[PDB]
Amino acid sequence: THPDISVDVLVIGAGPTGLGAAKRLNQIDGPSWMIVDSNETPGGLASTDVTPEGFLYDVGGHVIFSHYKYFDDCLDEALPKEDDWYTHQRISYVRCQGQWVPYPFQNNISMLPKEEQVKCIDGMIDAALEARVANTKPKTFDEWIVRMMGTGIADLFMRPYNFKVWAVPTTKMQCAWLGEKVAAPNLKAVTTNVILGKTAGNWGPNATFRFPARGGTGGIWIAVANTLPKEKTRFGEKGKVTKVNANNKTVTLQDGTTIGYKKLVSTMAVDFLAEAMNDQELVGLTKQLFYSSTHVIGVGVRGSRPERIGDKCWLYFPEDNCPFYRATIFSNYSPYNQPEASKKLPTMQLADGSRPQSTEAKEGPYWSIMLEVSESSMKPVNQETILADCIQGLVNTEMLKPTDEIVSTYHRRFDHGYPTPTLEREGALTQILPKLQDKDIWSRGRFGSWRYEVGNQDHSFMLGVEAVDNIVNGAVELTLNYPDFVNGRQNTERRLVDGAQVFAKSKAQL
Amino acid sequence: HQRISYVRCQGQWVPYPFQNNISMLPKEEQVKCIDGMIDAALEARVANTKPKTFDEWIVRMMGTGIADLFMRPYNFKVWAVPTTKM
Numbered sequence: 001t002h003p004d005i006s007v008d009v010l011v012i013g014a015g016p017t018g019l020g021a022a023k024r025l026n027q028i029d030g031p032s033w034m035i036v037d038s039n040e041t042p043g044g045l046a047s048t049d050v051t052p053e054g055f056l057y058d059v060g061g062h063v064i065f066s067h068y069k070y071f072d073d074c075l076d077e078a079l080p081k082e083d084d085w086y087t088h089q090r091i092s093y094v095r096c097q098g099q100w101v102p103y104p105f106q107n108n109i110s111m112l113p114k115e116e117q118v119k120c121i122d123g124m125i126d127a128a129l130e131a132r133v134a135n136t137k138p139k140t141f142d143e144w145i146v147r148m149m150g151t152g153i154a155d156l157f158m159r160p161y162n163f164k165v166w167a168v169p170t171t172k173m174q175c176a177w178l179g180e181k182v183a184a185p186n187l188k189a190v191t192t193n194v195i196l197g198k199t200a201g202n203w204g205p206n207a208t209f210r211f212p213a214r215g216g217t218g219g220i221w222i223a224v225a226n227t228l229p230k231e232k233t234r235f236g237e238k239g240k241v242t243k244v245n246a247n248n249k250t251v252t253l254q255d256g257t258t259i260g261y262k263k264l265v266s267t268m269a270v271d272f273l274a275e276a277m278n279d280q281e282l283v284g285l286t287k288q289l290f291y292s293s294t295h296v297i298g299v300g301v302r303g304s305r306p307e308r309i310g311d312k313c314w315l316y317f318p319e320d321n322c323p324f325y326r327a328t329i330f331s332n333y334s335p336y337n338q339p340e341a342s343k344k345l346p347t348m349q350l351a352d353g354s355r356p357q358s359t360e361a362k363e364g365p366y367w368s369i370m371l372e373v374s375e376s377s378m379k380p381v382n383q384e385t386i387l388a389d390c391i392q393g394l395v396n397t398e399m400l401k402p403t404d405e406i407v408s409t410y411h412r413r414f415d416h417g418y419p420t421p422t423l424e425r426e427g428a429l430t431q432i433l434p435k436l437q438d439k440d441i442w443s444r445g446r447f448g449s450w451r452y453e454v455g456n457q458d459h460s461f462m463l464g465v466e467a468v469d470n471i472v473n474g475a476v477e478l479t480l481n482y483p484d485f486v487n488g489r490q491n492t493e494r495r496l497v498d499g500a501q502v503f504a505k506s507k508a509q510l
Numbered sequence: 511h512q513r514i515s516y517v518r519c520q521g522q523w524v525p526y527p528f529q530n531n532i533s534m535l536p537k538e539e540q541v542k543c544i545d546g547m548i549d550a551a552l553e554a555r556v557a558n559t560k561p562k563t564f565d566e567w568i569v570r571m572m573g574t575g576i577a578d579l580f581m582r583p584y585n586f587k588v589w590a591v592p593t594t595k596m
């Protein structure tokens with residue numbers, strides 16, 4: 001029997017990856033296509049929730065810094081107005097020994113206690129000498145750390161923090177993933193700073209960035225989705241894929257609709273895809289991948305932004321006096337992420353956990369904090385007490401004063417948080433992805449292709465754009481297979497308007 | 511007597527031996543000195559030959575920093591010959 005619908009290229013999922021695919025498919029305007037999503041609102045893990053009190057929370061707080069001009073082009077098309085964006089400078093610190101060490105930590109030893117400083121430089125010297133002679137390569141993420149920073153920093157920050165976020169020991173992870181993620185410290189630069197007491201916080205793709213004025217990052221992906229022809233979309237319960245028949249190239253949707261395809265671009269989690277295919281081999285294969293779940297906690301507090309907080313952006317917490325690994329002053333990103341000062345809200349509780357002095361609706365202004373906590377079979381979290389442990393954690397780290405007035409809470413558990421860069425990961429992926437490609441299925445995205453190196457909105461979006469370009473023009477998928485390549489260059493060649501469109505336009509005016 | 515010996519540099523009294531007391535120098539000078547020691551230490555880890563001149567020895571063991579700030583000028587001032595000739 002024939003499918004209810006037939007198209008050349010079918011995109012599953014409307015997060016950044018999928019929309020990337022849809023944008024390029026829309027630009028080329030050649031083969032027929034369709035994008036579906038089980039959610040009425042596109043954006044996936046890049047979406048935004050709002051509390052009953054009017055606070056916005058990303059999925060951990062998201063940040064736009066682009067390696068691609070194509071990515072930029074599409075954002076400027078969705079949000080063309082100027083007052084649609086704010087530009088920020090990256091103010092990032094690490095919490096250590098009661099200090100706010102400027103990021104990257106390994107580059108600002110100066111702020112630590114003198115006692116600790118000595119232990120870090122000692123380690124760094126032992127490594128710089130051993131690295132002067134090394135000929136082999138690091139096997140684990142742990143070996144990589146010890147070699148690039150020394151034991152001083154490893155025990156002080158790297159080891160404890162990484163477990164805290166990955167929910168697995170540094171010894172169980174690979175190291176080919178950390179190109180532009182972890183800074184390798186230069187002895188000359190580290191000591192120079194310790195001597196001058198200066199700071200080095202320019203490092204990284206994060207230095208400067210922009211944030212959407214309204215709707216958080218979620219509003220971006222809504223704006224983008226609006227540029228696509230509606231007739232080619234299915235968002236909501238009518239767009240969930242419940243079965244994938246790779247053998248006869250059909251997909252079955254939640255309401256029973258079937259779609260035939262020639263090429264399939266899938267952005268759903270590859271472990272879910274295996275299930276929906278009912279393929280025993282792929283299931284056993286995907287079950288060798290590892291992932292951590294992420295608890296996002298949102299806290300809205302009353303008052304004008306404290307001076308202790310200032311223009312800070314996101315913070316790191318390697319110490320065990322709080323459950324979360326990262327915190328974001330989400331209210332500094334936009335004046336529309338929290339209620340306006342005039343809005344009246346009762347105090348739900350004080351930061352220390354006790355009842356407020358007054359429960360009457362008072363005015364603002366307000367600010368917001370967003371926290372992330374990791375969870376895995378190696379690092380369990382109690383779902384009934386986590387919110388309380390975070391708030392307390394906030395006090396322990398001098399983020400909030402015990403007497404601070406909390407006006408709103410938020411808590412959500414995302415089962416698939418991070419795709420874990422385990423030692424076994426590439427062993428499994430190098431099987432799965434080619435096996436899926438041989439069925440004409442491009443599985444791409446954070447959990448589509450499972451590579452954290454290149455998980456991230458701009459990267460994921462591009463993974464999509466490239467999967468289409470590979471399917472239609474034979475383009476090599478650079479972002480997928482060569483993360484270091486795309487990350488250390490300016491990717492300017494592909495644009496939202498290429499020659500193919502320019503020529504086709506003049507040929508019509510001709 | 512105990513040896514109380516300093517080197518006069520940049521209007522400071524740097525305790526002898528100079529190359530062990532970079533602490534007392536101005537911060538800007540300290541930077542040049544440590545950078546040299548690091549580049550020198552990193553080459554020392556790998557050397558298998560022996561220095562020819564006195565100058566090659568000073569660069570290998572203290573770096574360009576200390577070499578240019580103290581050693582080179584001083585050693586001429588006392589030996590009345592360039593380090594390169596010793």
Ligand SMILES: Cc1cc2c(cc1C)N(C[C@H](O)[C@H](O)[C@H](O)COP(=O)(O)OP(=O)(O)OC[C@H]1O[C@@H](n3cnc4c(N)ncnc43)[C@H](O)[C@@H]1O)c1[nH]c(=O)[nH]c(=O)c1N2
Pocket residue numbers: 012013014015016017018036037038039042043044045046059060061062063064065239240241242267268269294372416417418444445446447448455456457458460
């Ligand atoms: C905690 C944390 C923090 C960060 C970020 C994420 C996370 C979780 N990100 C990365 C980012 O969120 C990510 O790259 C994109 O969301 C990935 O897009 P995907 O489409 O691949 O996945 P994602 O999961 O987001 O989207 C896929 C979609 O597919 C749909 N779907 C699933 N199954 C389906 C089915 N069966 N049928 C139909 N639809 C289905 C989902 O409903 C959804 O709409 C990020 N990015 C950034 O650049 N800055 C940052 O700060 C960070 N940091």
Ligand SMILES: O=c1ccn([C@@H]2O[C@H](COP(=O)(O)OP(=O)(O)O)[C@@H](O)[C@H]2O)c(=O)[nH]1
Pocket residue numbers: 094103104105106162165181182183316
């Ligand atoms: O001060 C720091 C903080 C971060 N990291 C490393 O950077 C990685 C990713 O940090 P980032 O916040 O950029 O990752 P994200 O979760 O936002 O994708 C972490 O796993 C750490 O190993 C680091 O080297 N120094």
Ligand SMILES: O=c1ccn([C@@H]2O[C@H](COP(=O)(O)OP(=O)(O)O)[C@@H](O)[C@H]2O)c(=O)[nH]1
Pocket residue numbers: 517526527528529585588
């Ligand atoms: O702070 C110092 C002082 C001395 N010198 C070196 O030590 C050598 C001998 O100095 P010393 O005063 O011991 O010589 P003396 O004149 O007493 O025999 C000199 O040539 C310098 O090269 C040095 O390395 N650092």
